[PDB]
Design a binder for this molecule. Structure first.
Ligand SMILES: CC(=O)N[C@H]1[C@H](O[C@H]2[C@@H](O)[C@@H](CO)O[C@@H](O[C@H]3[C@H](O)[C@@H](O)[C@H](O)O[C@@H]3CO)[C@@H]2O)O[C@H](CO)[C@@H](O)[C@@H]1O
Ligand code: UDP
Ligand code: MN
Length: 273
């Protein structure tokens, strides 16, 4: 009986003011966002969204950034009329970080919850400044964080595909998901760009005004040093993507916590092999 949501949401108010200098109380955010259900799940009451979106955040030791993320994104995702859930993929242990492997985990685990057909991969410290910037999937892979304050409100290079992005289930599968062996900082986003290009796709983007994005200024994380093998790795994506990714992934889930505003999956993704 519920009709389809309008194709573009009429609830959008456009540009927004974003500030990171006050404290955030998640209990309060939960009260300001009463329609968000346990585990950070929301679909609209009045219409059926065609967008079944799992939002996937790679994570370790960024609780403060995360509270800001939840405070800003949650009202925006409801105005966009999405059928969505938030997944924070928490890396167990204190060995070298692996951003892309955590993303793969999030894809695979979120599918166990619900028939998601769209995946948004979002770093924890990026907040969109304009709710016209749609956090859902298109017929090509979507790069969302296109105009970040830290790159002067434009793309750092035209093939940049870091920060926030959205792939439909079919696009993510078509590239065998993300690489598992980018350990430490950098390059895995370029590798993923390569993968899309090698499977016949191109990058869809909003314009630079709608795509405006703030990055929470923060200092360097321990245990995520620039990976010095990144430049070699990106040069060989075409060959490696064939057998590195979804089809070579294992991990061990240690703990699943359903909090009011998000599901946190704590996972042992191991160390380099
Ligand atoms: C592989 C990698 O590290 N990718 C990250 C990306 O780094 C690239 C980016 O900094 C661009 C321009 O900003 O420069 C790239 O290096 C080039 C240098 O410009 C140049 O001095 C050298 O001669 O050639 C290089 C290749 O043309 C650099 O690799 O930056 C983004 C955002 O910080 C990360 O998301 C990527 O992981
Ligand atoms: O110790 C870490 C390292 C990074 N990340 C996540 O990985 C993303 C990318 O790392 P980073 O912040 O270093 O990129 P930068 O903006 O500094 O270039 C972050 O936004 C977080 O989501 C994290 O949670 N803990
Ligand atoms: Mn950052």
């Amino acid at each position: 009986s519920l009709p389809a949501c309008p194709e573009e949401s009429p609830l959008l108010v456009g540009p927004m003011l974003i500030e990171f200098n006050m404290p955030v109380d998640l209990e309060l955010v939960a009260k300001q966002n009463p329609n968000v259900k346990m585990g950070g799940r929301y679909a609209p009451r009045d219409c059926v969204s065609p967008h079944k979106v799992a939002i996937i955040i790679p994570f370790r030791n960024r609780q403060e950034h995360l509270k800001y993320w939840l405070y800003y994104l949650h009202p925006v995702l409801q105005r966009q009329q999405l059928d969505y859930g938030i997944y924070v993929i928490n890396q167990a242990g204190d060995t070298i970080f692996n951003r892309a492997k955590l993303l793969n985990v999030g894809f695979q685990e979120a599918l166990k919850d619900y028939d998601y057909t769209c995946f948004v991969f979002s770093d924890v410290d990026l907040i969109p400044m304009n709710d016209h910037n749609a956090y859902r999937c298109f017929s090509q892979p979507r790069h969302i964080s296109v105009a970040m304050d830290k790159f002067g409100f434009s793309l750092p290079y035209v093939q940049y595909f870091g920060g926030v992005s959205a792939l439909s289930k079919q696009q993510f599968l078509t590239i065998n998901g993300f690489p598992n062996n980018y350990w430490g900082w950098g390059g895995e986003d370029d590798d993923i760009f390569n993968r899309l290009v090698f499977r016949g796709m191109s990058i869809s983007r909003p314009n630079a005004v709608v795509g405006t994005t703030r990055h929470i200024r923060h200092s360097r994380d321990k245990k995520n040093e620039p990976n010095p093998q990144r430049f070699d790795r990106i040069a060989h994506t075409k060959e490696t993507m064939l057998s590195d990714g979804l089809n070579s992934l294992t991990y061990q889930v240690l703990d699943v916590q359903r909090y009011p505003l998000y599901t946190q999956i704590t996972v042992d993704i191991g160390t380099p092999s």
